[model samples]
Target: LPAHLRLQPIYWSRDDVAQWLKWAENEFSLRPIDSNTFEMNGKALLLLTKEDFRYRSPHSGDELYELLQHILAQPAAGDELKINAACRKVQHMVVKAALLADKFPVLHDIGNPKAIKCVPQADVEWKFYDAQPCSDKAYKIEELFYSYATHSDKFTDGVCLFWNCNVDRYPANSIVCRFDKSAFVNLKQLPFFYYSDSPCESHYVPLKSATCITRCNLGGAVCRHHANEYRLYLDAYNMMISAGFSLWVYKQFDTYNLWNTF
Candidate 1:
Protein backbone atom coordinates (compact mmCIF):
# COMPACT_ATOMS: atom_id res chain seq x y z
CA LEU A 1 0.00 0.00 0.00
CA PRO A 2 1.20 3.53 -0.69
CA ALA A 3 1.34 6.28 1.96
CA HIS A 4 -0.63 8.81 -0.06
CA LEU A 5 -3.27 6.16 -0.70
CA ARG A 6 -3.72 5.53 3.04
CA LEU A 7 -4.63 9.16 4.02
CA GLN A 8 -8.35 8.31 4.23
CA PRO A 9 -9.72 5.12 5.77
CA ILE A 10 -12.68 3.24 4.49
CA TYR A 11 -14.50 0.19 5.80
CA TRP A 12 -13.37 -3.03 4.15
CA SER A 13 -15.34 -6.14 3.23
CA ARG A 14 -14.73 -9.15 5.50
CA ASP A 15 -13.61 -11.19 2.52
CA ASP A 16 -11.16 -8.51 1.40
CA VAL A 17 -9.69 -7.87 4.87
CA ALA A 18 -9.36 -11.59 5.57
CA GLN A 19 -7.66 -12.21 2.25
CA TRP A 20 -5.20 -9.37 2.80
CA LEU A 21 -4.23 -10.62 6.24
CA LYS A 22 -3.77 -14.14 4.92
CA TRP A 23 -1.51 -12.82 2.20
CA ALA A 24 0.63 -11.01 4.77
CA GLU A 25 1.02 -14.16 6.83
CA ASN A 26 2.34 -16.16 3.92
CA GLU A 27 4.46 -13.46 2.38
CA PHE A 28 6.58 -12.82 5.45
CA SER A 29 7.45 -16.51 5.68
CA LEU A 30 10.03 -16.45 2.87
CA ARG A 31 13.20 -15.21 4.53
CA PRO A 32 13.51 -13.82 8.03
CA ILE A 33 16.79 -12.00 7.37
CA ASP A 34 16.84 -8.26 7.94
CA SER A 35 17.19 -6.11 4.85
CA ASN A 36 19.92 -4.00 6.42
CA THR A 37 22.09 -7.07 6.83
CA PHE A 38 21.24 -8.61 3.48
CA GLU A 39 23.94 -9.53 0.98
CA MET A 40 23.74 -8.84 -2.75
CA ASN A 41 25.49 -10.89 -5.38
CA GLY A 42 28.27 -8.60 -6.54
CA LYS A 43 27.39 -7.29 -9.97
CA ALA A 44 29.16 -8.32 -13.17
CA LEU A 45 29.88 -5.31 -15.28
CA LEU A 46 32.76 -4.66 -17.72
CA LEU A 47 34.80 -1.78 -16.45
CA LEU A 48 37.80 -0.36 -18.27
CA THR A 49 39.47 -2.80 -20.65
CA LYS A 50 41.64 -5.57 -19.17
CA GLU A 51 44.66 -3.31 -19.58
CA ASP A 52 43.59 -1.60 -16.36
CA PHE A 53 45.02 -4.43 -14.28
CA ARG A 54 48.16 -2.39 -13.58
CA TYR A 55 46.11 0.18 -11.66
CA ARG A 56 44.59 -2.48 -9.42
CA SER A 57 47.96 -4.13 -8.79
CA PRO A 58 50.46 -1.29 -9.00
CA HIS A 59 54.10 -1.91 -7.93
CA SER A 60 53.79 -5.70 -7.64
CA GLY A 61 54.30 -8.93 -9.75
CA ASP A 62 56.58 -11.89 -8.93
CA GLU A 63 55.34 -12.12 -5.37
CA LEU A 64 51.89 -11.35 -6.74
CA TYR A 65 52.22 -14.35 -9.06
CA GLU A 66 53.23 -16.60 -6.18
CA LEU A 67 50.34 -15.19 -4.13
CA LEU A 68 47.81 -16.13 -6.80
CA GLN A 69 49.21 -19.62 -7.05
CA HIS A 70 49.11 -19.93 -3.27
CA ILE A 71 45.55 -18.58 -3.15
CA LEU A 72 44.41 -21.19 -5.69
CA ALA A 73 45.76 -23.89 -3.38
CA GLN A 74 43.84 -23.32 -0.10
CA PRO A 75 41.29 -21.86 2.37
CA ALA A 76 38.67 -24.38 1.19
CA ALA A 77 38.28 -26.95 -1.55
CA GLY A 78 34.93 -25.51 -2.62
CA ASP A 79 34.66 -24.81 -6.32
CA GLU A 80 33.12 -21.32 -6.29
CA LEU A 81 35.34 -20.07 -3.49
CA LYS A 82 38.46 -21.31 -5.22
CA ILE A 83 37.11 -20.13 -8.51
CA ASN A 84 36.57 -16.64 -7.14
CA ALA A 85 40.06 -16.85 -5.73
CA ALA A 86 41.26 -18.01 -9.11
CA CYS A 87 39.48 -15.14 -10.82
CA ARG A 88 41.11 -12.66 -8.47
CA LYS A 89 44.45 -14.35 -8.99
CA VAL A 90 43.96 -14.35 -12.73
CA GLN A 91 43.23 -10.63 -12.81
CA HIS A 92 46.33 -9.82 -10.78
CA MET A 93 48.60 -12.01 -12.90
CA VAL A 94 47.26 -10.50 -16.10
CA VAL A 95 48.03 -6.96 -14.95
CA LYS A 96 51.48 -7.84 -13.64
CA ALA A 97 52.29 -9.53 -16.90
CA ALA A 98 51.05 -6.46 -18.75
CA LEU A 99 53.35 -4.12 -16.80
CA LEU A 100 56.30 -6.39 -17.48
CA ALA A 101 55.30 -7.03 -21.07
CA ASP A 102 55.18 -3.34 -21.89
CA LYS A 103 58.84 -2.94 -20.95
CA PHE A 104 59.75 -5.80 -23.32
CA PRO A 105 57.25 -6.98 -25.92
CA VAL A 106 57.55 -9.94 -28.28
CA LEU A 107 56.94 -9.72 -32.03
CA HIS A 108 53.35 -10.90 -31.77
CA ASP A 109 50.06 -9.57 -32.98
CA ILE A 110 46.61 -9.62 -31.28
CA GLY A 111 45.01 -10.41 -34.67
CA ASN A 112 41.22 -10.10 -34.45
CA PRO A 113 40.05 -9.84 -30.85
CA LYS A 114 36.86 -11.56 -32.05
CA ALA A 115 38.54 -14.51 -33.75
CA ILE A 116 40.03 -15.75 -30.47
CA LYS A 117 38.48 -19.01 -29.23
CA CYS A 118 38.95 -21.93 -26.87
CA VAL A 119 40.42 -24.85 -28.80
CA PRO A 120 43.55 -26.97 -29.14
CA GLN A 121 46.82 -24.97 -29.20
CA ALA A 122 49.35 -27.70 -28.54
CA ASP A 123 49.98 -31.39 -27.78
CA VAL A 124 50.41 -30.36 -24.13
CA GLU A 125 47.31 -28.18 -23.58
CA TRP A 126 44.20 -26.39 -24.85
CA LYS A 127 44.39 -22.64 -25.58
CA PHE A 128 41.58 -20.17 -25.80
CA TYR A 129 43.90 -17.47 -27.18
CA ASP A 130 46.34 -19.28 -29.41
CA ALA A 131 49.63 -17.24 -29.60
CA GLN A 132 49.48 -17.67 -33.35
CA PRO A 133 45.84 -18.01 -34.38
CA CYS A 134 45.13 -21.73 -35.04
CA SER A 135 48.78 -22.53 -34.31
CA ASP A 136 49.99 -25.46 -32.18
CA LYS A 137 52.12 -23.71 -29.56
CA ALA A 138 51.45 -21.86 -26.28
CA TYR A 139 53.22 -18.63 -25.24
CA LYS A 140 56.40 -18.79 -23.20
CA ILE A 141 55.12 -16.65 -20.29
CA GLU A 142 51.42 -17.31 -20.74
CA GLU A 143 48.54 -15.66 -18.89
CA LEU A 144 45.52 -17.21 -17.20
CA PHE A 145 42.40 -17.40 -19.40
CA TYR A 146 38.72 -17.40 -18.39
CA SER A 147 35.08 -16.55 -19.26
CA TYR A 148 32.44 -16.49 -16.50
CA ALA A 149 28.71 -16.13 -15.65
CA THR A 150 26.51 -15.35 -12.70
CA HIS A 151 23.38 -17.17 -11.54
CA SER A 152 19.92 -15.54 -11.59
CA ASP A 153 18.81 -16.10 -7.98
CA LYS A 154 21.19 -13.31 -6.81
CA PHE A 155 21.43 -14.89 -3.35
CA THR A 156 24.35 -17.21 -3.91
CA ASP A 157 27.57 -15.18 -3.63
CA GLY A 158 29.74 -14.95 -6.76
CA VAL A 159 32.99 -16.49 -8.09
CA CYS A 160 31.63 -20.01 -7.85
CA LEU A 161 34.09 -21.66 -10.30
CA PHE A 162 31.49 -23.45 -12.43
CA TRP A 163 30.13 -20.79 -14.78
CA ASN A 164 28.26 -21.70 -17.95
CA CYS A 165 29.94 -19.58 -20.60
CA ASN A 166 30.18 -19.51 -24.40
CA VAL A 167 33.09 -17.79 -26.13
CA ASP A 168 30.77 -16.80 -28.95
CA ARG A 169 28.08 -15.54 -26.60
CA TYR A 170 30.29 -13.01 -24.72
CA PRO A 171 33.76 -13.13 -26.18
CA ALA A 172 34.70 -9.63 -25.10
CA ASN A 173 35.06 -10.93 -21.54
CA SER A 174 37.41 -13.69 -22.59
CA ILE A 175 41.04 -13.49 -21.39
CA VAL A 176 43.73 -15.45 -23.21
CA CYS A 177 47.09 -16.86 -22.13
CA ARG A 178 50.26 -16.22 -24.14
CA PHE A 179 53.93 -16.26 -23.25
CA ASP A 180 55.33 -12.82 -22.52
CA LYS A 181 57.87 -12.01 -25.23
CA SER A 182 58.91 -8.98 -23.17
CA ALA A 183 60.23 -10.78 -20.12
CA PHE A 184 61.50 -13.66 -22.24
CA VAL A 185 63.43 -11.64 -24.84
CA ASN A 186 65.25 -9.50 -22.26
CA LEU A 187 66.58 -11.14 -19.11
CA LYS A 188 66.71 -7.65 -17.54
CA GLN A 189 62.89 -7.29 -17.90
CA LEU A 190 63.14 -8.29 -14.23
CA PRO A 191 60.93 -8.97 -11.20
CA PHE A 192 58.75 -6.64 -9.09
CA PHE A 193 60.22 -3.14 -8.88
CA TYR A 194 60.42 -2.26 -5.19
CA TYR A 195 60.03 1.26 -3.80
CA SER A 196 61.44 0.42 -0.39
CA ASP A 197 64.75 1.57 1.14
CA SER A 198 66.08 -2.01 1.46
CA PRO A 199 65.92 -4.89 -1.04
CA CYS A 200 62.52 -6.63 -0.94
CA GLU A 201 62.87 -10.07 0.66
CA SER A 202 59.95 -12.05 2.15
CA HIS A 203 58.29 -9.13 3.95
CA TYR A 204 55.11 -7.54 2.49
CA VAL A 205 55.77 -4.32 0.59
CA PRO A 206 52.98 -1.74 0.43
CA LEU A 207 52.28 0.12 -2.84
CA LYS A 208 53.29 3.77 -2.85
CA SER A 209 50.99 6.10 -4.75
CA ALA A 210 51.92 6.74 -8.38
CA THR A 211 49.32 7.07 -11.16
CA CYS A 212 47.54 3.70 -10.92
CA ILE A 213 46.38 2.06 -14.16
CA THR A 214 42.93 0.99 -12.92
CA ARG A 215 40.51 3.88 -12.52
CA CYS A 216 39.28 2.59 -9.15
CA ASN A 217 41.27 5.31 -7.43
CA LEU A 218 38.93 6.96 -4.94
CA GLY A 219 39.42 8.77 -1.61
CA GLY A 220 43.20 8.48 -2.01
CA ALA A 221 43.38 4.74 -2.69
CA VAL A 222 43.25 2.39 -5.67
CA CYS A 223 40.59 -0.30 -5.14
CA ARG A 224 39.50 -3.42 -7.02
CA HIS A 225 36.11 -1.88 -7.90
CA HIS A 226 37.48 -1.20 -11.37
CA ALA A 227 37.50 -4.88 -12.40
CA ASN A 228 33.73 -5.22 -12.81
CA GLU A 229 33.11 -1.74 -14.21
CA TYR A 230 31.74 0.90 -11.86
CA ARG A 231 30.24 -1.68 -9.50
CA LEU A 232 32.07 -1.35 -6.18
CA TYR A 233 29.83 -3.78 -4.32
CA LEU A 234 26.18 -4.86 -4.14
CA ASP A 235 23.55 -2.82 -2.33
CA ALA A 236 20.09 -3.76 -0.95
CA TYR A 237 18.69 -3.39 -4.47
CA ASN A 238 21.34 -5.36 -6.35
CA MET A 239 20.15 -8.67 -4.96
CA MET A 240 18.32 -6.78 -7.48
CA ILE A 241 14.75 -8.03 -6.98
CA SER A 242 14.13 -10.30 -3.98
CA ALA A 243 11.94 -8.00 -1.89
CA GLY A 244 8.46 -8.76 -3.31
CA PHE A 245 8.79 -12.39 -2.21
CA SER A 246 11.74 -13.04 0.08
CA LEU A 247 11.64 -10.24 2.62
CA TRP A 248 9.22 -7.98 4.51
CA VAL A 249 8.10 -4.83 2.70
CA TYR A 250 6.23 -2.83 5.32
CA LYS A 251 9.30 -1.20 6.76
CA GLN A 252 7.81 1.66 8.81
CA PHE A 253 10.99 3.23 10.16
CA ASP A 254 12.91 3.44 6.88
CA THR A 255 11.84 6.92 5.78
CA TYR A 256 11.94 8.73 9.14
CA ASN A 257 12.25 8.01 12.85
CA LEU A 258 8.84 8.51 14.51
CA TRP A 259 8.76 9.57 18.15
CA ASN A 260 7.21 6.44 19.74
CA THR A 261 7.77 7.23 23.44
CA PHE A 262 4.42 8.97 23.86
Candidate 2:
Protein backbone atom coordinates (compact mmCIF):
# COMPACT_ATOMS: atom_id res chain seq x y z
CA LEU A 1 0.00 0.00 0.00
CA PRO A 2 1.15 3.56 -0.72
CA ALA A 3 2.15 5.84 2.17
CA HIS A 4 -1.22 7.70 1.93
CA LEU A 5 -3.02 4.33 1.85
CA ARG A 6 -0.78 2.77 4.56
CA LEU A 7 -2.37 4.82 7.35
CA GLN A 8 -5.85 4.21 6.00
CA PRO A 9 -8.47 6.95 6.07
CA ILE A 10 -9.95 6.98 9.55
CA TYR A 11 -13.68 7.49 10.06
CA TRP A 12 -15.25 10.83 10.89
CA SER A 13 -15.99 10.35 14.55
CA ARG A 14 -16.19 12.52 17.66
CA ASP A 15 -12.49 12.06 18.36
CA ASP A 16 -11.45 13.02 14.82
CA VAL A 17 -13.73 16.07 14.79
CA ALA A 18 -12.41 17.22 18.15
CA GLN A 19 -8.77 16.82 17.12
CA TRP A 20 -9.28 18.69 13.86
CA LEU A 21 -11.10 21.61 15.48
CA LYS A 22 -8.48 21.80 18.24
CA TRP A 23 -5.92 23.55 16.01
CA ALA A 24 -7.82 24.23 12.79
CA GLU A 25 -10.83 25.84 14.43
CA ASN A 26 -12.85 28.20 12.27
CA GLU A 27 -15.58 30.05 14.15
CA PHE A 28 -18.13 30.32 11.34
CA SER A 29 -17.15 27.12 9.56
CA LEU A 30 -17.96 24.48 12.17
CA ARG A 31 -20.82 25.14 14.56
CA PRO A 32 -20.98 22.39 17.15
CA ILE A 33 -24.51 20.92 17.28
CA ASP A 34 -24.01 18.57 20.20
CA SER A 35 -21.52 16.14 21.69
CA ASN A 36 -18.44 15.58 19.48
CA THR A 37 -20.60 16.22 16.41
CA PHE A 38 -20.86 19.63 14.81
CA GLU A 39 -23.07 21.08 12.11
CA MET A 40 -20.14 21.03 9.68
CA ASN A 41 -22.54 21.78 6.86
CA GLY A 42 -22.40 24.27 3.99
CA LYS A 43 -18.74 25.28 4.65
CA ALA A 44 -16.74 22.09 4.28
CA LEU A 45 -15.18 21.24 0.91
CA LEU A 46 -15.40 17.45 0.53
CA LEU A 47 -17.24 17.08 3.87
CA LEU A 48 -16.25 13.44 4.25
CA THR A 49 -15.54 11.65 7.53
CA LYS A 50 -15.74 8.28 9.31
CA GLU A 51 -19.55 8.21 9.31
CA ASP A 52 -19.42 9.16 5.66
CA PHE A 53 -18.43 5.65 4.67
CA ARG A 54 -19.80 3.68 7.66
CA TYR A 55 -21.93 1.58 5.32
CA ARG A 56 -19.16 -0.15 3.31
CA SER A 57 -21.58 -2.88 2.21
CA PRO A 58 -24.97 -3.39 0.56
CA HIS A 59 -27.40 -4.90 3.13
CA SER A 60 -28.55 -3.07 6.26
CA GLY A 61 -31.41 -3.74 8.69
CA ASP A 62 -31.65 -3.97 12.44
CA GLU A 63 -28.42 -4.90 14.29
CA LEU A 64 -29.12 -8.65 14.17
CA TYR A 65 -29.84 -8.60 10.43
CA GLU A 66 -26.66 -6.65 9.71
CA LEU A 67 -24.54 -8.90 11.93
CA LEU A 68 -25.89 -12.10 10.38
CA GLN A 69 -25.27 -10.81 6.88
CA HIS A 70 -21.73 -9.83 7.81
CA ILE A 71 -20.99 -13.26 9.27
CA LEU A 72 -22.27 -15.01 6.15
CA ALA A 73 -20.43 -12.63 3.77
CA GLN A 74 -17.14 -12.58 5.67
CA PRO A 75 -16.21 -15.99 7.11
CA ALA A 76 -16.06 -15.91 10.90
CA ALA A 77 -12.66 -16.53 12.42
CA GLY A 78 -11.85 -20.10 13.66
CA ASP A 79 -13.28 -23.50 12.72
CA GLU A 80 -15.39 -23.40 9.56
CA LEU A 81 -17.41 -26.57 10.21
CA LYS A 82 -19.22 -25.41 13.35
CA ILE A 83 -19.58 -21.90 11.93
CA ASN A 84 -21.43 -23.17 8.86
CA ALA A 85 -23.84 -25.06 11.05
CA ALA A 86 -24.58 -21.98 13.10
CA CYS A 87 -25.05 -19.88 10.00
CA ARG A 88 -27.57 -22.39 8.69
CA LYS A 89 -29.60 -22.10 11.87
CA VAL A 90 -29.60 -18.29 11.70
CA GLN A 91 -30.35 -18.32 7.97
CA HIS A 92 -33.30 -20.62 8.55
CA MET A 93 -34.54 -18.38 11.33
CA VAL A 94 -34.37 -15.34 9.07
CA VAL A 95 -36.33 -17.24 6.41
CA LYS A 96 -38.95 -18.12 8.98
CA ALA A 97 -39.30 -14.47 9.94
CA ALA A 98 -39.69 -13.46 6.31
CA LEU A 99 -42.39 -16.05 5.82
CA LEU A 100 -44.22 -15.10 9.00
CA ALA A 101 -44.07 -11.39 8.20
CA ASP A 102 -45.81 -12.10 4.95
CA LYS A 103 -48.36 -14.55 6.34
CA PHE A 104 -49.33 -13.06 9.74
CA PRO A 105 -51.32 -10.12 8.34
CA VAL A 106 -53.88 -12.44 6.79
CA LEU A 107 -54.41 -14.08 10.15
CA HIS A 108 -54.39 -10.67 11.84
CA ASP A 109 -57.20 -9.38 9.62
CA ILE A 110 -59.14 -12.63 9.72
CA GLY A 111 -58.93 -12.80 13.50
CA ASN A 112 -61.04 -9.61 13.63
CA PRO A 113 -61.32 -8.56 9.98
CA LYS A 114 -61.67 -4.91 11.11
CA ALA A 115 -58.45 -5.27 13.10
CA ILE A 116 -56.05 -4.81 10.16
CA LYS A 117 -57.84 -3.83 6.96
CA CYS A 118 -56.44 -1.96 3.90
CA VAL A 119 -58.96 -0.26 1.58
CA PRO A 120 -58.34 2.22 -1.22
CA GLN A 121 -58.68 6.04 -1.16
CA ALA A 122 -61.57 6.09 -3.62
CA ASP A 123 -63.19 3.61 -1.26
CA VAL A 124 -62.26 5.61 1.87
CA GLU A 125 -64.50 8.39 3.22
CA TRP A 126 -61.33 9.82 4.84
CA LYS A 127 -62.20 10.59 8.47
CA PHE A 128 -59.96 13.68 8.71
CA TYR A 129 -57.34 11.16 10.14
CA ASP A 130 -57.73 11.78 13.91
CA ALA A 131 -60.88 13.30 15.37
CA GLN A 132 -63.07 10.30 16.21
CA PRO A 133 -62.95 6.49 16.06
CA CYS A 134 -62.67 5.60 12.39
CA SER A 135 -66.20 5.03 11.07
CA ASP A 136 -65.76 1.86 9.07
CA LYS A 137 -69.34 2.00 7.81
CA ALA A 138 -67.71 -0.65 5.61
CA TYR A 139 -66.25 -3.08 8.19
CA LYS A 140 -63.08 -3.93 10.23
CA ILE A 141 -60.69 -5.60 7.79
CA GLU A 142 -61.11 -2.69 5.40
CA GLU A 143 -60.68 -0.17 8.21
CA LEU A 144 -57.12 -1.14 9.06
CA PHE A 145 -55.99 -1.47 5.47
CA TYR A 146 -57.57 1.88 4.64
CA SER A 147 -55.84 3.63 7.56
CA TYR A 148 -52.62 1.75 7.01
CA ALA A 149 -52.46 2.98 3.44
CA THR A 150 -53.69 6.56 4.03
CA HIS A 151 -52.43 7.24 7.59
CA SER A 152 -56.06 8.07 8.38
CA ASP A 153 -57.49 6.96 11.70
CA LYS A 154 -61.17 6.33 12.54
CA PHE A 155 -60.86 6.75 16.30
CA THR A 156 -59.62 10.08 14.97
CA ASP A 157 -56.19 9.35 16.39
CA GLY A 158 -53.42 10.30 13.95
CA VAL A 159 -51.61 6.95 14.00
CA CYS A 160 -52.55 3.78 12.19
CA LEU A 161 -53.54 1.37 14.97
CA PHE A 162 -52.56 -2.19 14.06
CA TRP A 163 -54.84 -5.18 14.66
CA ASN A 164 -54.70 -6.12 18.35
CA CYS A 165 -52.30 -3.19 18.93
CA ASN A 166 -52.50 0.07 20.83
CA VAL A 167 -50.52 2.44 23.09
CA ASP A 168 -50.42 -0.53 25.48
CA ARG A 169 -49.33 -3.16 22.95
CA TYR A 170 -47.12 -2.14 20.04
CA PRO A 171 -44.28 -3.59 18.02
CA ALA A 172 -41.32 -3.08 20.31
CA ASN A 173 -39.19 -4.63 17.58
CA SER A 174 -40.19 -2.00 15.03
CA ILE A 175 -37.55 0.64 14.35
CA VAL A 176 -38.42 4.32 14.85
CA CYS A 177 -36.11 7.29 14.51
CA ARG A 178 -35.78 10.25 16.86
CA PHE A 179 -33.26 13.02 16.08
CA ASP A 180 -33.76 15.13 19.17
CA LYS A 181 -31.60 16.00 22.19
CA SER A 182 -29.65 19.04 20.95
CA ALA A 183 -29.87 17.53 17.48
CA PHE A 184 -32.33 19.07 15.02
CA VAL A 185 -34.75 17.09 12.86
CA ASN A 186 -36.71 18.49 9.95
CA LEU A 187 -40.44 18.11 10.56
CA LYS A 188 -41.16 17.29 6.91
CA GLN A 189 -38.81 14.32 6.62
CA LEU A 190 -40.27 12.06 9.31
CA PRO A 191 -43.50 10.10 9.70
CA PHE A 192 -46.06 12.72 10.75
CA PHE A 193 -46.55 10.68 13.92
CA TYR A 194 -43.50 9.02 15.52
CA TYR A 195 -43.14 6.69 18.49
CA SER A 196 -42.65 7.91 22.06
CA ASP A 197 -41.27 6.64 25.37
CA SER A 198 -44.63 7.07 27.11
CA PRO A 199 -46.85 4.64 29.01
CA CYS A 200 -50.50 4.99 27.86
CA GLU A 201 -50.09 5.89 24.17
CA SER A 202 -46.43 5.28 23.46
CA HIS A 203 -46.60 6.30 19.81
CA TYR A 204 -47.46 9.75 18.32
CA VAL A 205 -47.50 12.56 15.76
CA PRO A 206 -48.42 16.29 15.83
CA LEU A 207 -52.05 17.17 15.03
CA LYS A 208 -52.09 20.91 14.26
CA SER A 209 -49.13 20.09 12.03
CA ALA A 210 -51.58 18.87 9.41
CA THR A 211 -54.44 20.99 8.01
CA CYS A 212 -56.80 18.37 6.58
CA ILE A 213 -59.59 19.10 9.05
CA THR A 214 -62.43 21.55 8.40
CA ARG A 215 -61.38 24.52 10.51
CA CYS A 216 -59.93 27.82 9.30
CA ASN A 217 -56.18 27.25 9.13
CA LEU A 218 -54.39 29.45 11.67
CA GLY A 219 -52.30 30.95 8.89
CA GLY A 220 -50.96 27.42 8.63
CA ALA A 221 -49.21 27.66 12.01
CA VAL A 222 -51.71 26.12 14.42
CA CYS A 223 -55.22 25.18 13.38
CA ARG A 224 -57.70 22.33 12.71
CA HIS A 225 -57.24 20.72 16.15
CA HIS A 226 -60.34 18.77 17.33
CA ALA A 227 -62.85 20.72 19.40
CA ASN A 228 -60.94 21.61 22.60
CA GLU A 229 -58.60 18.92 21.30
CA TYR A 230 -56.01 19.15 24.12
CA ARG A 231 -53.35 20.45 21.72
CA LEU A 232 -53.35 24.15 22.68
CA TYR A 233 -49.69 24.67 23.42
CA LEU A 234 -47.53 26.02 20.58
CA ASP A 235 -44.84 28.07 22.26
CA ALA A 236 -41.45 28.58 20.62
CA TYR A 237 -40.76 24.88 21.37
CA ASN A 238 -39.52 25.33 24.99
CA MET A 239 -41.98 22.95 26.68
CA MET A 240 -39.25 21.18 28.67
CA ILE A 241 -38.62 19.37 25.43
CA SER A 242 -35.88 19.61 22.82
CA ALA A 243 -38.21 18.93 19.85
CA GLY A 244 -40.33 16.21 21.47
CA PHE A 245 -40.32 14.26 24.68
CA SER A 246 -42.15 10.89 24.95
CA LEU A 247 -44.86 12.62 22.82
CA TRP A 248 -47.86 10.93 24.42
CA VAL A 249 -46.97 13.63 26.92
CA TYR A 250 -49.11 15.90 24.76
CA LYS A 251 -52.21 13.91 25.71
CA GLN A 252 -50.91 12.94 29.15
CA PHE A 253 -50.37 16.57 30.16
CA ASP A 254 -52.67 19.24 28.79
CA THR A 255 -54.12 22.57 29.99
CA TYR A 256 -57.83 21.79 29.49
CA ASN A 257 -57.65 19.06 32.11
CA LEU A 258 -55.80 19.56 35.40
CA TRP A 259 -56.50 15.99 36.53
CA ASN A 260 -54.29 14.95 33.62
CA THR A 261 -51.01 15.30 35.54
CA PHE A 262 -49.88 11.71 36.03
Number of the top-ranking candidate, with TM-score as the measure: 1
Q: Which ten contiguous residues of candidate 2 have the minimum total lDDT?
A: 186-195
- Model 1, span 121-237: residue lDDT tens: 212221123223333334332332322233123212211111122121222212232211221121111121111111223211233333222322323343433322222111111
RMSD (CA, Å), candidate 1 to true, equals 25.8
Can you write out model 2's per-residue Cα lDDT over 1-262, one digit (the tens) per residue? 1111111112223343334333222422333233233323212312433344133211211222333234335532333443334333322222222222222221122113322223221122322112233456334334332322243222332222222222222221121122122111111111111111122221224454442222232333322233223232211111212222222111121221211211
| Candidate 2 C-alpha error for residue 8, in Å | 33
Query: Which stretches of model 1 miss by more than 4 angstroms?
Result: 1-32, 37-102, 107-262
Candidate 2 regions exceeding 4 Å error are 1-102, 105-133, 136-167, 170-262
| Deviation in Å, model 2, residue 5 alpha carbon | 37
lDDT of 1: 0.24
| Reference-based lDDT, residue 234, model 1 | 15
